[PDB]
Design a protein around this ligand. Structure first.
Ligand code: 55J
Length: 257
């Protein structure tokens, strides 16, 4: 079992604060991170989502997936994971503008792909893969998490952005978010930088009038990688490759550098 007996977790510095969640740096057999719920009495829907998150996390045991460590019900609903040292891929690329060498960029892609393939094998759809959810641990290991606390439309596949079905979320949807993550790694930028209207980005991506400008890729970006990016970003979801095949392509281009 993974229930941490109450009076063990020492919640400390509030690192992130959101609408429902609040992440704290903590202490439980060393430094840990604690996702918590603000309320003293939780909603039956809140208790379900906590049960679901812990449910997903207890199915994961992989280096590219954030280490689930335990849960706690009393006093507040809390999910304990490892504490990570460093910053998210988003922070690196877009906040502090870290200039990674092409070889590292491809490795960050390979690691994200590795973690993605694991989740998909375990029939887990992330639904929200983005650079803010890729943690570059000890500055070298990708750790896929859910560092969000609330949409994030830049990584959404046209079929998702359209909401033309009850569940438009697929393994393919995640492949498109991965495609956008590759665009970030290879351009050092977010897509649709020149468009200042969210609703229009939404409208156009859905209608397929707008796609990421692949000409923005770094000069040293391998032709194979740019091709892979293009496949991951296909408007038609059936045309998108899956992570076993994505991994294969990344690992191959990595060898030719
Ligand atoms: C419960 N829960 C999850 N859920 C999750 C669900 C599914 C999956 C998957 F299965 F789909 F993979 C993966 C994760 N993700 C989390 C992320 C959390 O934040 C953390 C964790 C570790 N370190 C930090 C940090 N270190 C330095 C800094 C900074 F930013 F302050 F510098 N922040 C921050 C806390 C709790 C988290």
């Amino acid at each position: 079992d993974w229930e941490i007996p109450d009076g063990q977790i020492t919640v400390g510095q509030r690192i992130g604060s959101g609408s429902f969640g609040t992440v704290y740096k903590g202490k439980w057999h060393g430094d840990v991170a604690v996702k918590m719920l603000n309320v003293t009495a939780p909603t039956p829907q809140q208790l379900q989502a906590f049960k679901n998150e812990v449910g997903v996390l207890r199915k994961t045991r992989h280096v590219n997936i954030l280490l689930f460590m335990g849960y706690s019900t009393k006093p507040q609903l809390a999910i304990v994971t490892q504490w990570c040292e460093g910053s998210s891929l988003y922070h690196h690329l877009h906040i502090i503008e870290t200039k990674f060498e092409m070889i590292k960029l491809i490795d960050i892609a390979r690691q994200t792909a590795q973690g993605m393939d694991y989740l998909h094998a375990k029939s887990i759809i992330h639904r929200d893969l983005k650079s803010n959810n890729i943690f570059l641990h000890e500055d070298l290991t990708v750790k896929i998490g859910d560092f969000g606390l609330a949409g994030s439309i830049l990584w959404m596949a046209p079929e998702v952005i359209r909401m033309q079905d009850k569940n438009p979320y697929s393994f393919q949807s995640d492949v498109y978010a991965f495609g956008i993550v590759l665009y970030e790694l290879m351009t050092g930028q977010l897509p649709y930088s020149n468009i200042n209207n969210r609703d229009q980005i939404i409208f156009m991506v859905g209608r397929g009038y707008l796609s990421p400008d692949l000409s923005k890729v770094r000069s040293n970006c391998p032709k194979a990688m740019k091709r892979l990016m293009a496949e991951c970003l296909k408007k038609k979801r059936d045309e998108r490759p899956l992570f076993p095949q994505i991994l294969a392509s990344i690992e191959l281009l990595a060898r030719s550098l």
